[PDB]
Design a protein around this nucleic acid. Sequence first.
RNA 1: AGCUAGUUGGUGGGGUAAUGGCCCACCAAGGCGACGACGGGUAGCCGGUCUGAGAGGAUGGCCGGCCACAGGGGCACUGAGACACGGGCCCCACUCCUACGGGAGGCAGCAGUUAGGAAUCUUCCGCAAUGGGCGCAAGCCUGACGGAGCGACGCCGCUUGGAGGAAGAAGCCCUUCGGGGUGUAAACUCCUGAACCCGGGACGAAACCCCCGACGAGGGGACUGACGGUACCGGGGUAAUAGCGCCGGCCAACUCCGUGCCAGCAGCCGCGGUAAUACGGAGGGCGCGAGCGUUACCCGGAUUCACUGGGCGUAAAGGGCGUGUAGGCGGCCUGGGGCGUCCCAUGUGAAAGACCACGGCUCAACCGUGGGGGAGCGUGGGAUACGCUCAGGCUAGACGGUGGGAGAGGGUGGUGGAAUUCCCGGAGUAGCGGUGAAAUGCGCAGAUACCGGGAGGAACGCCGAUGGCGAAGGCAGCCACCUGGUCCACCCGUGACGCUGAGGCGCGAAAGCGUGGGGAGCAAACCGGAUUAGAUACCCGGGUAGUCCACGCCCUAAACGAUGCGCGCUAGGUCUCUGGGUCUCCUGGGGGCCGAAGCUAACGCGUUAAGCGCGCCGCCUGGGGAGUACGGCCGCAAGGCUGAAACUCAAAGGAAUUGACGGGGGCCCGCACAAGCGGUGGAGCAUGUGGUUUAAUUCGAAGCAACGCGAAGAACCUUACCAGGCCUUGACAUGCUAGGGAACCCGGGUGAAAGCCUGGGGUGCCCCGCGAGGGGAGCCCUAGCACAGGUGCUGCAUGGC
RNA 2: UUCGGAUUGGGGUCUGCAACCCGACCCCAUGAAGCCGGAAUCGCUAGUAAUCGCGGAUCAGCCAUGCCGCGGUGAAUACG
RNA 3: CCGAGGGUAGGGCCCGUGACUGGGGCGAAGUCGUAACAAGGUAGCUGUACCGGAAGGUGCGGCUGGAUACCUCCUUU
RNA 4: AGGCAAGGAGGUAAAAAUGUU
RNA 5: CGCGGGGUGGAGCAGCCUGGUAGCUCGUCGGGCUCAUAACCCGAAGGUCGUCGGUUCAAAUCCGGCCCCCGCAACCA
Lengths: 59, 71
Amino acid sequence: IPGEGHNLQEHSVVLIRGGRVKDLPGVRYHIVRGVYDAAGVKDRKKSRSKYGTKKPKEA
Amino acid sequence: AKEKDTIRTEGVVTEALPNATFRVKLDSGPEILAYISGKMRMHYIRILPGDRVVVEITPYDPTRGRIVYRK
RNA sequence: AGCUAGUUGGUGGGGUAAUGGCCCACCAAGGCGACGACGGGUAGCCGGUCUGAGAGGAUGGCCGGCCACAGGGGCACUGAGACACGGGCCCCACUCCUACGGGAGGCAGCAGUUAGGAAUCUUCCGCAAUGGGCGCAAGCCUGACGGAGCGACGCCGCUUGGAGGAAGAAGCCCUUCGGGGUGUAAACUCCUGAACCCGGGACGAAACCCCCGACGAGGGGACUGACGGUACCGGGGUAAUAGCGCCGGCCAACUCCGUGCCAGCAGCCGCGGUAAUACGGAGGGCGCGAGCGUUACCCGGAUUCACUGGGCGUAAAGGGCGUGUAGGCGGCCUGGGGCGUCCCAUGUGAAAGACCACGGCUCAACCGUGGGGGAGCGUGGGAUACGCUCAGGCUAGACGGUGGGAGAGGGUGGUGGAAUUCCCGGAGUAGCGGUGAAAUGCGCAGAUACCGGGAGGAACGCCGAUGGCGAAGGCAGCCACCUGGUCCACCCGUGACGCUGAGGCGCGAAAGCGUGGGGAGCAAACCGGAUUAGAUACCCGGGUAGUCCACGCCCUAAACGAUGCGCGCUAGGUCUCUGGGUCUCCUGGGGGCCGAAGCUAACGCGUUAAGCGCGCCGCCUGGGGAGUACGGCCGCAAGGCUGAAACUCAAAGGAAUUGACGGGGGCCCGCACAAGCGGUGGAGCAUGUGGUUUAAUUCGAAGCAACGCGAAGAACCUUACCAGGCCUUGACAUGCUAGGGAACCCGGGUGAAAGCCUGGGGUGCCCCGCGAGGGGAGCCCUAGCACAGGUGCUGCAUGGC
RNA sequence: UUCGGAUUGGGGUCUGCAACCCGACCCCAUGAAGCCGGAAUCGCUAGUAAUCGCGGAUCAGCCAUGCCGCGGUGAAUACG
RNA sequence: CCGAGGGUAGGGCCCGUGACUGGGGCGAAGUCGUAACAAGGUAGCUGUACCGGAAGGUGCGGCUGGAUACCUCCUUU
RNA sequence: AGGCAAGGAGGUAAAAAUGUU
RNA sequence: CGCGGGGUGGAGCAGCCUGGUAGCUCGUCGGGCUCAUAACCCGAAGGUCGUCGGUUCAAAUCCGGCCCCCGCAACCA
Ligand SMILES: [Mg+2]
Ligand SMILES: [Mg+2]
Ligand SMILES: [Mg+2]
Ligand SMILES: [Mg+2]
Ligand SMILES: [Mg+2]
Ligand SMILES: [Mg+2]
Ligand SMILES: [Mg+2]
Ligand SMILES: [Mg+2]
Ligand SMILES: [Mg+2]
Ligand SMILES: [Mg+2]
Ligand SMILES: [Mg+2]
Ligand SMILES: [Mg+2]
Ligand SMILES: [Mg+2]
Ligand SMILES: [Mg+2]
Ligand SMILES: [Mg+2]
Ligand SMILES: [Mg+2]
Ligand SMILES: [Mg+2]
Ligand SMILES: [Mg+2]
Ligand SMILES: [Mg+2]
Ligand SMILES: [Mg+2]
Ligand SMILES: [Mg+2]
Ligand SMILES: [Mg+2]
Ligand SMILES: [Mg+2]
Ligand SMILES: [Mg+2]
Ligand SMILES: [Mg+2]
Ligand SMILES: [Mg+2]
Ligand SMILES: [Mg+2]
Ligand SMILES: [Mg+2]
Ligand SMILES: [Mg+2]
Ligand SMILES: [Mg+2]
Ligand SMILES: [Mg+2]
Ligand SMILES: [Mg+2]
Ligand SMILES: [Mg+2]
Ligand SMILES: [Mg+2]
Ligand SMILES: [Mg+2]
Ligand SMILES: [Mg+2]
Ligand SMILES: [Mg+2]
Ligand SMILES: [Mg+2]
Ligand SMILES: [Mg+2]
Ligand SMILES: [Mg+2]
Ligand SMILES: [Mg+2]
Ligand SMILES: [Mg+2]
């Protein structure tokens, strides 16, 4: 799980998109923030479509 | 944001393992996998079994820690 | 790796529109197979599509063709045609109704529900067009189809304005505080007028129908729109959605704070452990743009499965070699055939797509028209250079003969000494053995050493080699026998017989295993001793298997030239062995070395190629996993051969180079040892230190290169340490607020002094004023301040030295 | 021991405010250890080692037998 | 008669799980030891055999992808 | 006898463990 | 205290038994060796050899007394 701190838990429903992560052994899979119980990263403002974060609504 | 939920609890070192990973028995209660600080490694400060280090702890999983301070 | 019993062929018969093992009866005993049968997996196939320079590689969505199936399975029937999706029968499974006996179902038709799932649409209109079926026809059906609806799901098209408009507004960010950016972007002025409303508004649709004309050809007529009041055209008419990814390298684009190996990012390299061009934000920038990214899957790049286009001495990789079957491949000449091959003609290669032209929808998408091409395959004619094939021939290959030769080639039979060990005889005495040291060990029962004889088993010193032989493993006493290969001369004979070699057969060090012998030495395991922090080791002393032979098996290897075999070509020189010559030097056949060209990653290789070629085979496609597993075969077992993947890592690797290192080598040096003289360590003391003590024993200096050092002068000072007393902008510096007194000395008390309190001589300067008197400078005091001061800590922040 | 001078007692002398901690120096008495030093180990190749004394700096004084400097006497041995 | 299918024994494969058990990759400061790399301190590697916590060790054989000369004495130029 | 050697000789000691910055 | 084997430098032990010989092992002080801590290796002490007197030519060494020390008798009662 990427982001900055997951909302995720223990029996919550999630989405995989794959893709190896180099550091971590045997992990071939990114959980993808946005869909399901994998909610987005709060206060991303830049790279946020990779992270299920909808727009900072402007005034 | 840097989530500052990081649990700054002390523990006396039970055991030594490789890569400077250490089962440390806490003031808090449990003995959990807690690996070294990078800082300590840089400074060559040898953690040895029977020392009161500060094991920082994640609320996602307490069962793994991170050794912060020199004994 | 073997498969096959209707299985392969035949006679007759059945069946069929028709052949046929389609089926049956009977005979025959085949048929297929490594040119990959059968089995397992995968999979509708193609036109195509994507990609790709091409060859290929992947894929087969929609649209076109064919196939196969309609819950699973089986069967027929009707029929032109089905083995029959919305027909039937039967069984099975499931759903539904049941008055429990039984019946009815089939959306892999549209549409939709549900489930699964990341994911996929409207329970739409319409028979108007096209087609389909039926019908004289009218017409009737038609979820074929025509369309609309939903989805940026894809492709294409457009809009989110344009023009002006600061040496440059704010807002926000950076800052070197000058400025710069955002950015002519805005705001604002001018114009347009997407959207939106009003007006009209279809092509698609002229047939089928009627009538003249014979119900023909031909002529006139009329009906007939789901899309849609949409497309469009006319008028009016508003400035009117921007987003996402990235910004270290690849790769386009940089700064600030936040964060400090954390949070995090990642596709790889990797970034992060305090100014991160890489993490989080901000601005700024770049890429695209109604999209943009991510992930999957595929091609590419990847000449990374290599035909075009890789390789195999060391990198992954040459099989252990021989013989040999299939297969592949084949010297020269002469002709015939014409299979391959080439050409022409023609047939075929459907349409759609791909390609080129033009046309239409406002362009383009999309669609149309025309054209070409298109590999392959058939048919007819030819060509004969090559390959094939049949015939004739030739001797350069190959094989053979005659004359010889070298030889640890192999087997069989014997035999020769040296040695060891063992026994006996002699003589002999005190240890021998062993090691860096020793101990176990053997020996006064007389060992060890020495002679004499014998017993035996094993190996073969010197020659000996950089040597020879063999296909390889391998092979050495000597002799003889049988016997393999080989090499030369003569070119005499055969006339392409050749080369390779999947399998196969055969051999195959050493160990190992079986049966039996043999057994001297040696010698795993084993027991000893020692050595050692430990010793399951090196070392030593015993010692079983085994080493040895016979038969049988095993079949591996650094089975190495780490180099497959064959043939041809391409400077040499040099030694070497072995043959022939017209014999100081030629010419062959081996073994080495050094080197031309060339090759190669370099090392190297280099007529004994790793060069130029060609033939053929064997392998290789990251490492580790792993020569493992599973299967299969062999084996008495040991194990071998055959040979994976999951996973996991951005290495593993070679060659060379700089170093660095070495309990590697050589050359060289120095008072470094030797050669010599004199010390030191011992004595006392002089001092510096380590320690301990102390209120404190100032701080530092640490192997050489700390130690009569910094300390080149510690009673106080020094002095940095400690007890006590005291002082505070302070001993000293440059100022401030200022307030008084202020230049200055002479004292008194207390006190160890420092200091504290305190008296009193004591103001002149520059001055203005008749005077009283006033201010400022020098200078000094008090209170707060800017500040001093610190030998206070960091020589891994440093400079100097 | 007329070698040898430690240590100690007593009296002084000088410099400095002051020598108790903690000076130097003089005198007289005292006369310890030590008979050329283990295993080691340092120095030195020529006027050098060895020995012998003088001067300096710092400094009031000196704990300096130190350091720096100067000269006198004057070797040995280097095969390697 | 043929016949889908059923049943009854027997195997084959393939999925699910599966007590039991093998079990590999990587890992800075795990533990023992120091095998290897320099003659790595007994050359190493190698094939096989037995043994040992383990790296391994020894034996037999092979290989060189192994390092190596400097004094003294005998025979002879 | 030397010149430069050719060839066989037996010595070239055996250890050797550890790493707080 | 019955018995009987011993007290070894400082510690644990040999030599005792065939009588002349004090040895090893550990540690302590010097020194080497290193970057050291070593290990190591060198040396330097250090034995009334439990003692007493006895033997002899000579005694830890041979007989005894002991002081012992360890023990084990001191049990069936
Ligand atoms: Mg915290
Ligand atoms: Mg028939
Ligand atoms: Mg199947
Ligand atoms: Mg399929
Ligand atoms: Mg179709
Ligand atoms: Mg069916
Ligand atoms: Mg169905
Ligand atoms: Mg019919
Ligand atoms: Mg039908
Ligand atoms: Mg679902
Ligand atoms: Mg309807
Ligand atoms: Mg009708
Ligand atoms: Mg109907
Ligand atoms: Mg349609
Ligand atoms: Mg990012
Ligand atoms: Mg990046
Ligand atoms: Mg960033
Ligand atoms: Mg090729
Ligand atoms: Mg290649
Ligand atoms: Mg290789
Ligand atoms: Mg052939
Ligand atoms: Mg030919
Ligand atoms: Mg076509
Ligand atoms: Mg005898
Ligand atoms: Mg040969
Ligand atoms: Mg002839
Ligand atoms: Mg002839
Ligand atoms: Mg012929
Ligand atoms: Mg045997
Ligand atoms: Mg047997
Ligand atoms: Mg022996
Ligand atoms: Mg042993
Ligand atoms: Mg042995
Ligand atoms: Mg060989
Ligand atoms: Mg071959
Ligand atoms: Mg060249
Ligand atoms: Mg060469
Ligand atoms: Mg090559
Ligand atoms: Mg093997
Ligand atoms: Mg097997
Ligand atoms: Mg190399
Ligand atoms: Mg070794």
